Amino acid sequence: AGMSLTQVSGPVYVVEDNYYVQENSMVYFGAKGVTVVGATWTPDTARELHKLIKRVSRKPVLEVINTNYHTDRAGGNAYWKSIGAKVVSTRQTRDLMKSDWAEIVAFTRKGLPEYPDLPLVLPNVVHDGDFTLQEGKVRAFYAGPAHTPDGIFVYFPDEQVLYGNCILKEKLGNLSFADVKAYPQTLERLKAMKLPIKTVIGGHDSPLHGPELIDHYEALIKAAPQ
């Protein structure tokens, strides 16, 4: 299908968004409602995700996290705002989005001319640092720069699932905006946290991996050109 929504563990679901270049996002079905992690590529892809969500739960979409300022994590924002869902990010992500959205949209349209010329839609819930949602069961944190300067990890402690964002994935991928030397230092900062991890969800390629995805990408980025 164009998009799928699939249970990984308990209330934790993976979204495979096969629009444009495949990106994987997540959904958490909570007591009061639904948290989306990654806004998806466009307002259209966001509507498609919302349609899948409504087939699983009647509860409201409470909030959507922009895990970085890029089009694949924030492109859906217009749609999420339109249904009254909070759009959530760190201050850094919001500031970079304000300054650099036009440029990341232009860069996206270079490789994907079919991609829409989306206007800026900023987060309206902006956090000073690390933060949690869903009674502490969804935990967003910064461990340094990697694919972008601002990209955060999202950890689900009950299910021991780590969302890898654009930071962790199977293929080395486009290193254009990447801090290549800092990248492994961020992954080692993550390792030093010693989070219990059974599952890592890569933000591109095939989503479902074990904790080895971290080591897999670390080895790839340490061999990169640059």
Residue ranges at the known binding site for Zn(2+):
72, 166, 204
What mask of x and - would describe binding to Cl ion in positions 64 to 93, judged by CB under 5 A? ----x-------------------------
CA distance 67 to 146: 12
Structure tokens at 98: 């304000």
Q: Which is nearer to Cl ion, 7 or 82 (CB)?
A: 7
Binding residues (CB under 5 A) for Zn ion: these are 70, 72, 166, 209
The entry of Cl ion, Zn ion, none that residue 72 binds, CB within 5 to 8 Å by partner kind:
Zn ion
Torsion of CA 13, 155, 145, 85, to 10 degrees: 60
The entry of Cl ion, Zn ion, none that residue 70 binds, CB within 5 to 8 Å by partner kind:
Zn ion
Q: What is the DSSP letter of 144?
A: -
212 binds Cl ion (CB under 5 A): yes
Q: Which is nearer to Cl ion, 70 or 137 (CB)?
A: 70
Residue with tokens 């968004």: 17
- Around 180, how many Cα atoms within 13 Å sit in the side-chain half-sphere? 12
Q: What is the DSSP letter of 8?
A: E
108 binds Cl ion (CB under 5 A): no
Positions in 176-205 near Cl ion (CB under 5 A): none
Other beta carbons less than 10 A from residue 109's beta carbon: 15
Q: Which is nearer to Cl ion, 14 or 46 (CB)?
A: 14
CA distance 21 to 149: 21
Q: Which is nearer to Cl ion, 138 or 197 (CB)?
A: 197
Q: Which is nearer to Cl ion, 63 or 218 (CB)?
A: 218
CA distance 3 to 221: 29
Report in angstroms how near the CB of residue 40 gets to Cl ion at its nearest.
Answer: 15
In the bound state, the residue with its beta carbon closest to Cl ion is 151
Structure tokens at 198: 């059974």
Other beta carbons less than 10 A from residue 226's beta carbon: 6
Rg for the chain (alpha carbons), in Å?
16
The entry of Zn ion, Cl ion, none that residue 151 binds, CB within 5 to 8 Å by partner kind:
Cl ion
149 binds Cl ion (CB under 5 A): no
Tell me the window of 82-90, 127-135, 154-162, 165-173 that interacts with Cl ion (CB under 5 A).
Answer: 165-173
Structure tokens at 168: 């962790």
Note the residues at the interface with Cl ion (CB under 5 A): 6-7, 68, 106, 147-148, 151, 165-167, 209-210, 212-213, 216
